[PDB]
Scaffold this motif. Structure first.
Motif, mmCIF file in Angstrom:
data_model
loop_
_atom_site.group_PDB
_atom_site.id
_atom_site.type_symbol
_atom_site.label_atom_id
_atom_site.label_comp_id
_atom_site.label_asym_id
_atom_site.label_seq_id
_atom_site.Cartn_x
_atom_site.Cartn_y
_atom_site.Cartn_z
ATOM 1 N N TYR A 88 0.887 -1.230 -0.119
ATOM 2 C CA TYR A 88 0.004 0.007 0.131
ATOM 3 C C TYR A 88 0.978 1.080 0.040
ATOM 4 O O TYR A 88 1.923 1.317 0.463
ATOM 5 C CB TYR A 88 -0.917 0.148 1.226
ATOM 6 N N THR A 89 0.572 2.234 -0.868
ATOM 7 C CA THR A 89 1.198 3.561 -0.530
ATOM 8 C C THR A 89 0.124 4.572 -0.899
ATOM 9 O O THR A 89 -0.883 4.432 -1.819
ATOM 10 C CB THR A 89 2.278 3.694 -1.571
ATOM 11 N N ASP A 90 0.400 5.875 -0.334
ATOM 12 C CA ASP A 90 -0.579 6.937 -0.701
ATOM 13 C C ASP A 90 0.421 7.890 -1.380
ATOM 14 O O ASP A 90 -0.241 9.141 -1.802
ATOM 15 C CB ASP A 90 -1.219 7.565 0.413
ATOM 16 N N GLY A 91 1.626 7.902 -1.576
ATOM 17 C CA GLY A 91 2.566 8.896 -2.135
ATOM 18 C C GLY A 91 2.646 10.093 -1.561
ATOM 19 O O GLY A 91 3.080 11.004 -2.114
ATOM 20 N N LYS A 92 2.301 10.121 -0.060
ATOM 21 C CA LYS A 92 2.031 11.127 0.633
ATOM 22 C C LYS A 92 2.605 11.247 1.933
ATOM 23 O O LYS A 92 3.320 11.793 2.698
ATOM 24 C CB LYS A 92 0.824 11.830 0.560
ATOM 25 N N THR A 93 1.968 10.179 2.836
ATOM 26 C CA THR A 93 2.308 9.871 4.264
ATOM 27 C C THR A 93 2.913 8.786 4.805
ATOM 28 O O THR A 93 3.407 8.782 5.821
ATOM 29 C CB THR A 93 0.893 10.302 5.230
ATOM 30 N N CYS A 94 2.496 7.615 3.977
ATOM 31 C CA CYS A 94 3.239 6.207 4.369
ATOM 32 C C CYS A 94 3.080 5.036 3.457
ATOM 33 O O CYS A 94 2.669 5.264 2.470
ATOM 34 C CB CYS A 94 2.289 6.106 5.423
ATOM 35 N N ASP A 95 3.854 4.267 3.643
ATOM 36 C CA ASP A 95 3.790 3.055 2.713
ATOM 37 C C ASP A 95 3.718 1.637 3.716
ATOM 38 O O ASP A 95 4.430 1.582 4.845
ATOM 39 C CB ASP A 95 5.134 3.004 2.087
ATOM 40 N N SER A 109 8.507 11.573 7.095
ATOM 41 C CA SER A 109 8.897 12.493 8.166
ATOM 42 C C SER A 109 7.962 13.590 8.741
ATOM 43 O O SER A 109 8.190 14.093 9.993
ATOM 44 C CB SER A 109 10.233 13.135 7.556
ATOM 45 N N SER A 110 6.970 14.177 8.001
ATOM 46 C CA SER A 110 5.987 14.992 8.288
ATOM 47 C C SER A 110 5.001 14.312 9.201
ATOM 48 O O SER A 110 3.996 15.007 9.759
ATOM 49 C CB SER A 110 5.193 15.407 7.147
ATOM 50 N N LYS A 111 5.008 13.056 9.346
ATOM 51 C CA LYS A 111 3.777 12.379 10.063
ATOM 52 C C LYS A 111 4.035 11.380 11.300
ATOM 53 O O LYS A 111 3.672 10.547 11.613
ATOM 54 C CB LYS A 111 2.880 11.691 9.082
ATOM 55 N N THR A 112 5.564 11.558 11.766
ATOM 56 C CA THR A 112 6.141 10.801 12.733
ATOM 57 C C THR A 112 5.145 10.665 13.887
ATOM 58 O O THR A 112 5.519 9.758 14.732
ATOM 59 C CB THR A 112 7.606 11.205 13.043
ATOM 60 N N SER A 113 4.519 11.751 14.274
ATOM 61 C CA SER A 113 3.770 11.871 15.590
ATOM 62 C C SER A 113 2.355 11.072 15.150
ATOM 63 O O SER A 113 1.406 11.228 16.057
ATOM 64 C CB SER A 113 3.627 13.176 15.907
ATOM 65 N N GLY A 114 1.920 10.374 13.868
ATOM 66 C CA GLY A 114 0.682 10.249 13.671
ATOM 67 C C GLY A 114 -0.212 10.920 12.773
ATOM 68 O O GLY A 114 0.223 11.877 12.380
ATOM 69 N N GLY A 115 -1.087 10.343 12.286
ATOM 70 C CA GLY A 115 -2.063 11.213 11.380
ATOM 71 C C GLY A 115 -1.703 11.024 9.899
ATOM 72 O O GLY A 115 -2.194 11.887 9.224
ATOM 73 N N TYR A 116 -1.115 10.009 9.549
ATOM 74 C CA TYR A 116 -1.027 9.232 8.285
ATOM 75 C C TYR A 116 -2.214 8.578 7.849
ATOM 76 O O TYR A 116 -3.258 8.487 8.541
ATOM 77 C CB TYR A 116 0.420 8.379 8.270
#
Ligand SMILES: NCCc1c[nH]cn1
Ligand SMILES: NCCc1c[nH]cn1
Ligand SMILES: NCCc1c[nH]cn1
Length: 144
Positions: A88-95, A109-116
């Motif tokens: 799975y990828t969204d190309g934005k927040t996570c894979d 790196s923008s979402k290390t605290s959650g919210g991906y």
């Protein structure tokens, strides 16, 4: 969840938002190096390749750095002798990827605290199944 299915494009995964980088958040591997990261730069659409810098935190607490190339091959991300298949990828927040039998959750790196994207947690949980998850991102320096 329909939008969590069929998001398997390695090129999209490699690029992400084309800034920052990705941290390995959880893995089914034990003894993984803390603060494992990758960071793509100089994205080439012609070849679906990127410069890829990667490493992890060494004994003294500094990030190591090695630079090579990531090449997209359909669902697969290839760096040197290593191939990872995008689940799975969204190309934005996570894979979510599979590497060498292991299931990995990578977070931008923008979402290390959650919210991906929740699809990452859904597909990570589904793919690892009964294999326990191990946390990798702990007391990490900022992204190179
Ligand atoms: N955004 C892709 C992160 C990754 C995982 N493995 C290699 N690269
Ligand atoms: N298939 C890419 C595996 C990887 C992760 N980090 C460096 N290489
Ligand atoms: N084992 C070096 C490549 C890799 C895959 N996942 C994390 N790192």
């Amino acid at each position: 969840m329909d939008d969590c299915s069929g998001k398997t494009d390695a090129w999209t995964s490699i690029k992400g938002p084309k800034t920052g980088g990705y941290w390995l958040k959880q893995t089914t591997k034990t003894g993984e190096n803390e603060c494992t990261y990758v960071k793509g730069t100089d994205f080439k659409e012609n070849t679906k390749t990127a410069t890829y810098t990667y490493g992890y935190k060494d004994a003294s607490g500094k990030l190591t750095k090695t630079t090579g190339t990531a090449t997209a091959k359909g669902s697969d991300i290839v760096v040197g002798s290593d191939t990872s298949t995008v689940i799975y990828t969204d190309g934005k927040t996570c894979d979510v990827v599979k590497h060498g039998g292991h299931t990995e959750l990578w977070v931008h790196s923008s979402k290390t605290s959650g919210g991906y994207n929740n699809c990452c947690d859904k597909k990570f949980t589904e793919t690892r199944g009964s294999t326990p998850a191990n946390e990798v991102y702990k007391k990490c320096p900022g992204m190179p």
